[PDB]
Amino acid sequence: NNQNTF
Amino acid sequence: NNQNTF
Amino acid sequence: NNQNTF
Amino acid sequence: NNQNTF
Amino acid sequence: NNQNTF
Amino acid sequence: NNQNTF
């Protein structure tokens, strides 16, 4: 489970 | 920006 | 920016 | 910026 | 479980 | 469980 937000 | 994972 | 993971 | 992980 | 936010 | 925020 990997989450990125700019 | 909203992210959910189970 | 909100991130949740179980 | 809010991050939660179980 | 990996979370990044800018 | 790894969390980074700028």
Residue B5 corresponds to which amino acid? T
Separation between Cα atoms, residue C3 and residue A2, nearest integer Å: 10
Range 1-6 of F in CB contact (< 8 A) with D? 1, 3, 5-6
DSSP assignment, residue D2? E
Q: For the sheet containing A2-5, what is the strand order? A: A2-5, E2-5, F2-5
SS (H, E, C) chain E: CEEEEC
Separation between Cα atoms, residue C1 and residue B5, nearest integer Å: 15
Q: Which of B6, D4, B5, D3 is nearest to E6 (CA)?
A: D3
Are F and B close enough to touch, i.e. 3+ CB pairs under 8 angstroms?
no
Are D and E close enough to touch, i.e. 3+ CB pairs under 8 angstroms?
yes
Separation between Cα atoms, residue B5 and residue F3, nearest integer Å: 15
Q: Which token pair is C2?
A: 């909100």
Q: Do E5 and C3 touch (CB under 8 A)?
A: yes
Separation between Cα atoms, residue D5 and residue E3, nearest integer Å: 8
